[PDB]
Design a binder for this molecule. Structure first.
Ligand SMILES: *Cc1cc2c(nc3c(=O)[nH]c(=O)nc-3n2C[C@H](O)[C@H](O)[C@H](O)COP(=O)(O)OP(=O)(O)OC[C@H]2O[C@@H](n3cnc4c(N)ncnc43)[C@H](O)[C@@H]2O)c(*)c1C
Ligand SMILES: *Cc1cc2c(nc3c(=O)[nH]c(=O)nc-3n2C[C@H](O)[C@H](O)[C@H](O)COP(=O)(O)OP(=O)(O)OC[C@H]2O[C@@H](n3cnc4c(N)ncnc43)[C@H](O)[C@@H]2O)c(*)c1C
Ligand SMILES: OCc1cc(O)cc(-c2ccccn2)n1
Ligand SMILES: OCc1cc(O)cc(-c2ccccn2)n1
Lengths: 498, 498
């Protein structure tokens, strides 16, 4: 193996490595280390540990916050050159190096073996942060979460006397490292050590051919793409439309629903974007698939005056997945400053919550065509899992996501103000945040938001860690204390040892 | 390694594999063969040769025409699982397997080694088609063409008895197979054999460290992105703006220019789109770089009544390249029907030609936001090499490019009609095609257009092979007869033996 690359501030590459998906956070370490093998990750961590240096890891660069790129980080280990994806016959599982990106993973697994696993739809997202935090996407209703396929993980860890090792932790019942496995099923990136690779396999796979080791997705899908012109919207129409979407999703979010195969995402962009958009997809092989999609669209439009433009077509799965995917290049990906938020639902928003959203999404005093809240269908196979079995919170029927993206740092204050205000107004009855209760079930650690730990925005009394992990947090602390007892791996929202 | 994959029509992967960048052309072979090594590509070709099957190769699926997917193709060898990029210490050059995509090549080369090669901007374009056809991009004015770095090429070939073998052909003067190397420096894909891998290296490189074997791009670029509204854009404006663009490019298209680092692309969309668009870039370490972009923009708009909305910023090279690249996923990339055309220039379009483009670009009886023609700056270092030394015709100082993309197969005739009529009417003085002369240099093999072989659109009497290859065609024909004597590798625009 070629020796690990070290990139110092005098090297031309440093300024590029300092930048990832969020341009608000530019890293300035003493150096970037790019390793090629697990033994080089060991060496990198042990150097940092010996001299007390603050170390973080980057896989895909998609962190919503400054977890990797904090100005007090001294060393950044970038895993983008460990991206192998292959079947491992000794284990009967697909091996995925942590710097592989989801888009590449889907292509390799599918073309070479005809299988897939249910991760997210954004292309440049790294396996490192995605899987460990409880990755989901469009196939989750049918197949569950990424972590439901996590057979094993290999992790570089640091014990109380500064000794660095590489351990493989599996889900087998007698695995002495089982706890470290469980922590990676929703505990989140940057907490327990450097994940070097994951192994993926269905827990009920038959034999050991790769073609049976993970699920075959359905072969093709009816896809609907719908938009409603903002120029034609009223408050009442907005309220009614989102209510219909929500009501239909809450009736159809269990594995018993004959519509469980229908996945849909409603993007409510701010008015400056020109439209509200939705994409929906259903496997062709579901009984009456095409009629099911028609009933769904007709229900959506009941009692709503604006008529949508609609295109319907049929595509193979992988193409359906790339249609909906977010690009890793182009003006939407590169040089973009961002803020994201998250809130999960097991119940409908109220008419008052939706009128408040409408007030923020129609504001004519703001202009940002990439400002949006999104409602994302969820549930299904996700919620048939015993929730003790993984570290991811379960029970939401629907996720919601808030985002503003812009390019000018001059404008930071007004974009941050806009996203904070809409999210707080929506959650004004619960101290401005989704406190776990009858309607909210929390938030998703892979859409982190540090305003949850800010007394000016979170006036609920409920700490951030409850919001993101609910009842799994204290077990995560204990596993943290066992495996990273010096708190070498940390960030604003890292598991505190206890 | 793993045995090669065979995908027949009963396999769920077939419908996906049958679909590439252009949905107008759906492949229907007997099977797809996905090989993992050169030996397996030999086996695949030997099977098709033995039974006289019509065989084609796919790398990235970016062909503008049906050369891969044509219905008479029986076997398609898909190289997407051969996408290794690394330095090959033995030959002193970067090894690029034919199935690697340019997006991934630039990331690997730059991050691991701090180097690059001047290829194209589109992400999912495959090395196989791209390099052999004579790839270019944004850095070509400073660095030349991809083929200028082509140190060697490995090709699976078939002799007159139908024996299949592998040859490595190099650029070295004593190489007995130099002729095969030269044919790959612009002869285009799908002619001589299956390219399994390329080796890339500067001809003048010092020593044997990878960091020195290809050029380091400039670390940072000033970037400008510009758009003019169609709202009150008039013929007069349109014609002044492009003339201004062209005058400028033509004065500053040589290695003597202190503006040669300035690279710019003008997109003239149909009124449908709302705007005309332009992106420019210049390295940061060019003396007075920031001011030169100011001068360039000033001259552009002189005598032009629409005021351009403008944004300027500074980025690292690799970020700059990903900003202006075209995504390989999302609505712009997936499930899209396309038609492309091209014409290179050695001198300016006349006022009449521009009037004719304006008319077609303004035509209110047509709707297609994706319809455009583009002026892409070119020349510079490209034109300091001997036109003999590679198979790519050189001479153009500027490249032009035409495209319509849509999704509805029912609208094919309207979109084809538009692109065909605008192209014809701009070349109406020369029989509807850019005949090599004082002002036109031809067209580019990697933007193929079978309408140049259609008596109804090409009335110039100049055959397609002269437009694409000028003086180099007879030599290509001779290499073709020597290396593919049975014409195994062919398509509509393949080199005809003789
Ligand atoms: C940008 C982006 C993010 C998305 C998108 N869509 C998603 C979807 O459809 N479903 C999802 O479940 N999530 C989606 N996300 C959110 C992402 O899942 C998160 O942004 C992930 O956390 C990103 O992972 P990664 O790209 O690896 O980002 P990094 O910034 O490098 O790291 C995040 C976090 O994890 C730690 N970490 C990374 N790598 C490691 C390893 N190997 N070992 C330990 N820890 C690691 C980092 O230190 C950091 O703290 C769609 C889009 C466009
Ligand atoms: C879609 C697309 C194309 C682009 C884009 N931008 C370009 C740019 O910025 N600079 C360029 O110089 N060219 C650009 N092009 C055009 C592409 O260069 C061409 O479209 C390439 O030919 C595409 O290559 P590839 O993606 O490999 O396409 P295929 O469809 O697989 O094959 C093309 C042609 O080549 C033969 N062939 C492929 N692979 C091989 C191998 N290994 N050996 C021999 N022959 C091969 C095929 O049979 C076919 O004949 C921007 C965009 C978005
Ligand atoms: O998964 C939805 C989504 C879409 C998007 O454009 C961006 C993100 C995102 C971006 C950064 C951190 C977390 N999520 N998520
Ligand atoms: O090279 C410019 C460009 C842009 C684009 O969106 C598409 C293409 C293209 C698409 C198919 C075949 C050849 N070129 N080219």
């Amino acid at each position: 193996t070629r020796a690990a690359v070290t990139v110092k501030p005098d090297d031309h590459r440093y300024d590029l490595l300092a930048r990832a998906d969020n341009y608000r956070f530019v890293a300035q370490p003493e150096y970037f280390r790019l390793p090629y093998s697990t033994a080089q990750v060991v060496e990198a961590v042990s150097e940092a540990v010996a001299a007390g240096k603050r170390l973080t890891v980057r896989s895909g660069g998609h962190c919503g916050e400054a977890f990797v790129a904090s100005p007090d980080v001294d060393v950044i280990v970038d895993l983008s050159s460990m991206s192998h994806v292959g079947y491992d016959e000794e284990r009967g599982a697909f091996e995925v190096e942590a710097g592989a990106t989801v888009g590449q993973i889907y292509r390799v697994l599918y073309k070479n073996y005809g299988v897939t696993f249910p991760g997210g739809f954004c292309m440049g997202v790294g396996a490192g942060g995605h899987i460990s935090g409880g990755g989901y996407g469009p196939l989750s209703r049918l197949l569950g979460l990424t972590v439901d396929y996590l057979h094993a993980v290999e992790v570089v860890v640091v014990d109380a006397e500064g000794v660095v090792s590489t351990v493989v932790a599996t889900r087998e019942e007698d695995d002495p490292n089982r706890d470290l496995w469980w922590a990676h099923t929703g505990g989140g990136g940057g907490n327990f050590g450097v994940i070097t690779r994951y192994w993926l396999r269905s827990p009920d796979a038959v034999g050991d051919a790769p073609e049976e080791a993970l699920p075959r997705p359905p072969a093709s899908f009816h896809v609907a793409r719908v938009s409603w012109s903002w120029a034609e919207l009223t408050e009442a129409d907005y309220v009614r439309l989102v209510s219909n979407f929500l009501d239909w999703q809450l009736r159809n979010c269990t594995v018993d629903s004959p519509n469980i195969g229908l996945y849909a995402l409603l993007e409510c962009f701010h008015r400056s974007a020109g439209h509200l958009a939705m994409h929906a997809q259903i496997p062709v092989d579901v009984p009456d698939a095409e009629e099911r999609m028609s009933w769904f669209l007709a229900e959506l439009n009941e009692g709503v005056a604006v008529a949508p433009s609609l295109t319907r077509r049929r595509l193979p799965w992988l193409a359906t997945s790339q249609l909906l995917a977010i690009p890793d290049v182009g003006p939407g990906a590169i040089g973009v400053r961002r803020k994201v938020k998250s809130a999960d639902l097991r119940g409908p928003h109220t008419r008052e919550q939706l009128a408040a959203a409408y007030r923020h999404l129609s504001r004519a005093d703001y202009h940002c065509p990439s400002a949006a809240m999104e409602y994302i269908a969820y549930g299904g196979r996700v919620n048939t899992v015993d929730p003790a079995a993984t570290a991811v919170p379960r029970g939401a029927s629907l996720k919601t996501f808030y985002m503003v993206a812009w390019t000018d740092p001059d404008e930071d204050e007004e974009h941050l103000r806009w996203i904070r205000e809409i999210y707080r107004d929506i959650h004004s009855a619960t101290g401005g945040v989704p406190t776990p209760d009858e309607v909210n079930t929390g938030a998703y650690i892979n859409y982190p938001d540090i305003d949850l730990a800010d007394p000016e925005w979170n006036t609920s009394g409920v700490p951030w860690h409850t919001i993101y992990y609910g009842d799994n947090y204290p077990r995560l602390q204990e596993i943290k204390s066992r495996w990273d007892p010096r708190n070498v791996f940390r960030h604003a929202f890292s598991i505190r040892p206890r």
